[PDB]
Design a protein around this ligand. Structure first.
Ligand SMILES: Nc1ncnc2c1ncn2[C@@H]1O[C@H](COP(=O)(O)OP(=O)(O)O)[C@@H](O)[C@H]1O
Ligand SMILES: Nc1ncnc2c1ncn2[C@@H]1O[C@H](COP(=O)(O)OP(=O)(O)O)[C@@H](O)[C@H]1O
Ligand SMILES: [Mg+2]
Ligand SMILES: [Mg+2]
Ligand SMILES: [Zn+2]
Ligand SMILES: [Zn+2]
Ligand SMILES: [Zn+2]
Ligand SMILES: [Zn+2]
Ligand SMILES: [Zn+2]
Ligand SMILES: [Zn+2]
Lengths: 186, 590, 590
RNA sequence: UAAUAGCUUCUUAGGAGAAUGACGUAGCAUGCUACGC
RNA sequence: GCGUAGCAUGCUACGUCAUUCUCCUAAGAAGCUA
């Protein structure tokens, strides 16, 4: 507003009007200067309206630009995170067993539900009570999915280590069921 | 995306879209770049174009934004305002942008086309964040320049070891060696894809190629060859990490019974282990290839990454480290595409080993204890920034002689780039001097080594040998044919075969030439193993023959002469054309 | 961001900007503090500066709350109103702030520079909240005094093991010992960035410092050092938890025939069990820290945390516990840097062990059943608040004596501090008396105790040994070399060296001297274990050589000399300076 | 760790519209007065 | 009677400001239901 010369025109018109009023100018000159001051102030506020629109749309454009830059610098982060997750999952794969079962496929296509069941090297058995434990994986080795597994660890629901001697019929009340047993393919 | 301005490092979100590299630019810096040069396109988080139904205005000094878009003057709303005003270009972080008056050289960096000599000389003395940008845009310019080339194909199936060449008409053809590789395109009917890369080399006569293959997939005529104008990634690491000294050697623990072979360099080994980065310039044939092995034997338990610009130097270093260093804890890292006949003698390609040898282009992002860069004359600033980005190590050692030949530097055609501005490291070696320098030359005869020390050097070289009395220098005319992109001297080989019968020594010689066409034709009529003047500089030989084809400023380049005549050890037949080149040196007349 | 007033614990949102610790103050208390002292800056949720375009007015009586911000006298919006008026200062919770009469001691605490002695006797006899605030601001002032130490630099390096030093001209030079560290600069053009953490110590010959670093960077001559700063954390817990007298032992359990050696202190163990906290005051070497281990043997199931202000005292306590307690259930907690070499014989740094020994500063937040603070003379109110905050407990036992040497108090340089103002615990001991008191020396021979019952204690101690006649008092002038800003007495060390080969049974006597410089430099010339008087407290040795370095008010301190001599177990040779001090004791001839 | 969808309350901001009032400018209509024909 | 100038009254258009209301959108807090 003050940068534009409309303020300068308003200020010089007001100064001339005040000077002539103090100097006792005639009524016709007084009305002439009043009209000139009125049109100068009219131009001043009219361009101040354009300045209001300028600053408003400039702030809106700046906020939009900040938001777009933020949403574009947050897209690259999630793209990199997804890429790292996918490549780590690639590196986790049991490549030889998966290659065997996928070359045995006629079309190259296999059900997903058999991918762990035939290639996973580690089995987690979650057991709710002692009778189930005795049924499924009693002893240090057991059979599941037509394979042989050897118990490598047992933990309780509290993620505390449990020894195979502590899983008994009388020590069952003292164990935080369920028990998660981790076994490796033999 | 936001980033840092190139010449003031303030936060910004603009970009000079007309530039090849599109560098970030702060507000005041972007205004100073656009009002001065002819780049009038600026890319913000959205491109600064005219978002009208029909109109296409790219200039930014003639764009006014309104509402939520940018239009020209014929499509703007009743509201204002200029995008490019008050000394600034409207972008993010408008009041954190500090101007800088180093745009007066950023204009010359961004707008030049590298045709003249001065572009390199002012693309190397600028600041660091412009040292990187100039190298990046130079590499981009070279890559785009290799896109205007004489695409070819194979005429028809001709041999299992050799193909033929059917080029297009009206376009130049590249040099042919292991450096220039070529790509086949399978646009057959049906879906252009890649089958494999072949490198090419001139044939015996007429039109033929004796090649080097990448993939076994044998094409019909359905493929045509281009020159793999690949992409250039941006570079971020500085050319040279800051020089910080250490009191006593850190992370490097000296050895027991290193050898009685190289025990005179123990002071230089420890001076290598002292600073952050060290510089060793050794005149041709003074043991820098052997100094690397000695350094590896002076700090026995430190993993060392050897690196070089080209396969020849790194392969010679690999062979020496096989001959001296322990062998099983070695690992040469080969490219997956295998554009060269690579080196398979070690337990190859295990990046988690101790002595890791590699090329600059194929370095994997890893860490080391002390990394030895070799042939810094060959390396451009891009290679230095790459080796600083991919490799983090406690010590860096740059070895190489700036008096040898520079990089190809294909774009340069007018004027001579003096050695000082080959790269940052050669500038260091000429400004203050190499930190280490070994001046006793162990390859050349007496007269040649004394005269080479008196040719350009400030008389600092000598030989621990006697002169073998089998180096010569003749003046035989050697009529020129030159009916190919380079000059050839066949009847000079005629004169040399008029000799070479009373001289049974060199009958296993390596042929060198100042022109790749004569080098290619010299391996055809007589099967001399060849090695170009560029492919030298890092290996030693005892039988080498070198002829001069022409007489010009490319024939009197004393850097090339010094890198040529210092690869033989006991015998060289050589052809001199100019009386200048017969009189700076002492040899028998015949 | 609201809080509680320091001296009335009303609700508030104001803080004093000029105060180092920036304490919360209610409206009435803040008005009383600012209208009387020179502090004239008040921080609310927003600071009370004047919000003109540019104006800097901070005095609160000048300002007004005008419009929506704080404005000065001739920048205010025409609508007022005054901030600092109506007997208050405008802040949150304005009509709930009850003042006090402690705005006469708080002015003195905030204003004082801790130079005189009366500041400490007013910082320890005030109310409980002021006891914490005064300790906090005292630690803050002790830390900010280090900011006035001269910036260093390096002269050169002839020897890489001994740095050369150069202090800035016109500033004081800090003392060279282990307690002070430094961090560097390289401000040339070119890296105004730190270059590592170093530390210094003087050399005997010429001007040199045999430095030490955390890394192995060398200093190009422009690189230099500045002493860093330790920010002081806020503290909340009371200095002493209020005492309650139980009818019977709660939370603790006796034992079955504790031992035949600890059978005398059973009544004091029961008294400890009865009360919330207990104080044990006794002359040195009477059974105070051998009372705590007996207490552990009397309450076997009780988890116990032993703590002390020093490291060499808690180390002696650890050794005694190893001699008595089961070694399996012990620990030792060390700080991350571990400036001193600590005790490594138990399972170090396991907080959840039954008996846990640590310094006050490195205490981890945990619980216990009784916490044993030892050598409360070394501890200030900050240490008491720290141990009362981090370690919850059921019973507290403070063992120590006021007549030993107090905490350093580096800022104090005028007058002397009486024992009853060392901290709150010593004040309790001297005012009403200790809860447990045992005067009978069980460690030192008859001669040294019969002399120390004349220096410090007014003929109170009988003791138990026989004077072995190996108590020696030497006459030697001892010329002065004020070298490291702590004196070194080379000829006295020479006297010792010339008469330590004449004493075949004194080859292992510990060397004690008040000055750390001579104490550290003696290691080369005689090779004995060395120890300063301040850290020797709490540890016993079979033989002691004490050397009064120079006559001063530091080495002729009766408390220091009494805590120095009484570490002997069978004999002690001491060389003295003061004609009075050598005469007040009754030792052998020489 | 926290789903899909519907409805409702409250608060803030922006735009558009409406209504009323106020000021200023321009255009048009009327009454009175001064000068010239 | 006409032209020029001035004052007063009225209507329309435009610009600015104050108040009230409606709606359209965005953002946030919350409640209930299936
Ligand atoms: N200590 C030494 N004594 C004698 N000859 C040496 C010694 N060290 C190196 N040399 C010889 O110097 C020559 C150096 O050439 P090279 O090993 O290719 O490295 P460069 O090309 O960097 O000089 C070698 O041929 C080697 O035989
Ligand atoms: N009941 C006792 N019987 C025999 N000797 C004791 C007895 N109590 C303590 N002592 C001896 O007295 C010394 C006192 O040591 P300490 O308690 O550390 O003294 P201080 O607490 O003053 O440092 C111990 O070294 C111990 O050998
Ligand atoms: Mg070499
Ligand atoms: Mg004790
Ligand atoms: Zn540009
Ligand atoms: Zn900039
Ligand atoms: Zn347009
Ligand atoms: Zn204050
Ligand atoms: Zn208060
Ligand atoms: Zn003001």
């Amino acid at each position: 507003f003050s940068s534009l010369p409309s303020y300068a025109a308003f200020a010089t018109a007001q100064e001339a009007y005040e000077q002539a009023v103090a100097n006792g100018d005639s009524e016709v000159v007084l009305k002439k200067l009043k009209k000139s001051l009125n049109v100068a102030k009219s131009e001043f506020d009219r361009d101040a309206a354009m300045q209001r629109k300028l600053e408003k749309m400039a702030d809106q454009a700046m906020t939009q630009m900040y938001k777009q830059a933020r949403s574009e610098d947050k897209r690259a982060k999630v793209t990199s995170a997804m890429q790292t997750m996918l490549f780590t999952m690639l590196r986790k794969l049991d490549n030889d067993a998966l290659n065997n079962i996928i070359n045995n496929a006629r079309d190259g296509c296999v059900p997903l539900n058999i991918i762990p069941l035939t290639t996973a090297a580690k089995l987690m058995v979650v057991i709710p009570d002692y009778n189930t434990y005795k049924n499924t994986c009693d002893g240090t080795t057991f059979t599941y999915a037509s394979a042989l597994w050897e118990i490598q660890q047992v933990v309780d629901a509290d993620s505390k280590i449990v020894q195979l001697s502590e899983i008994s019929m009388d020590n069952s009340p003292n164990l935080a069921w369920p028990l998660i047993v981790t076994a490796l393919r033999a | 995306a936001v980033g840092a301005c190139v010449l003031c490092n303030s936060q910004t979100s603009l970009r000079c879209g007309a530039c090849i590299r599109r560098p970030f630019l702060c507000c005041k810096c972007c205004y100073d770049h656009v009002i001065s040069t002819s780049h009038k396109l600026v890319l913000s988080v959205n491109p600064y174009v005219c978002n009208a139904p029909g109109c296409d205005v790219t200039d930014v000094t003639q764009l006014y934004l309104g509402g939520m878009s940018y239009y020209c003057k014929s499509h703007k709303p009743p509201i204002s305002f200029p995008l490019c005003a008050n000394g600034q270009v409207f972008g993010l972080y408008k009041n954190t942008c500090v101007g800088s008056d180093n745009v007066t050289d950023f204009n010359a960096i961004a707008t030049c086309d590298w045709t003249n000599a001065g572009d390199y000389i002012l693309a190397n003395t600028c600041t660091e964040r412009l040292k990187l940008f100039a190298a990046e845009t130079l590499k981009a310019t070279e890559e785009t320049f290799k896109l205007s080339y004489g695409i070819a194909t194979v005429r028809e199936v001709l041999s299992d070891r050799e193909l033929h060449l059917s080029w297009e008409v009206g376009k130049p053809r590249p040099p042919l060696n292991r450096n220039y590789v070529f790509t086949g395109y399978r646009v057959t009917k049906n879906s252009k894809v890649q089958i494999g890369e072949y490198t090419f080399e001139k044939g015996d006569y007429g039109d033929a190629v004796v090649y080097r293959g990448t993939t076994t997939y044998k094409l019909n005529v359905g493929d045509y060859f281009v020159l793999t104008s690949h992409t250039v990634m941006p570079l971020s690491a500085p050319t040279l990490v800051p020089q910080e000294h250490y009191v006593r050697i850190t992370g490097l623990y000296p050895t027991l019974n290193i050898s009685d072979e190289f025990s005179s360099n123990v002071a230089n080994y420890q001076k290598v282990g002292m600073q952050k980065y060290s510089t060793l310039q050794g005149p041709p044939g003074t043991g820098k290839s052997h100094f690397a092995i000695g350094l590896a034997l002076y700090y026995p338990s430190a993993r060392i990454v050897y690196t070089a610009c080209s396969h020849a130097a790194v392969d010679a270093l690999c062979e020496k480290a096989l001959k001296y260093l322990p062998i099983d804890k070695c690992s040469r890292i080969i490219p997956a595409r295998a554009r060269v006949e690579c080196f398979d003698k070690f337990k190859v390609n295990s990046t988690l080993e101790q002595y890791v040898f590699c090329t600059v282009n194929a370095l994997p992002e890893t860490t080391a204890d002390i990394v030895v860069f070799d042939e810094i004359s060959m390396a451009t600033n891009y290679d230095l920034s790459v080796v600083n980005a991919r490799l983090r190590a406690k010590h860096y050692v740059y070895i190489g002689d700036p008096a040898q030949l520079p990089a190809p530097r294909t774009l340069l055609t007018k004027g001579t780039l003096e050695p000082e501005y080959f790269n940052s490291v050669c500038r260091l070696m000429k400004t203050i001097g190499p930190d280490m320098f070994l001046g006793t030359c162990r390859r050349c005869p007496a007269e040649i080594v004394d005269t080479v020390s008196a040719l350009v050097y400030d008389n600092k070289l000598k030989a621990h040998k006697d002169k073998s009395a089998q180096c010569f220098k003749m003046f035989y005319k050697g009529v020129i044919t030159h009916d190919v992109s380079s000059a050839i001297n066949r009847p000079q080989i005629g004169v040399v075969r008029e000799f070479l019968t009373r001289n049974p020594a060199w009958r296993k010689a390596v042929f060198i030439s100042p022109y790749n066409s004569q080098n290619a034709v010299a391996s055809k009529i007589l099967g001399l193993p060849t090695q170009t003047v560029d492919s030298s500089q890092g290996s030693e030989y005892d039988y080498v023959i070198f002829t001069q084809t022409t007489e010009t400023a490319h024939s009197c380049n004393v850097n090339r002469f010094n890198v040529a005549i210092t690869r033989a050890k006991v015998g060289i037949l050589c052809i001199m054309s100019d009386r200048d080149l017969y009189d700076k040196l002492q040899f028998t007349s015949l």
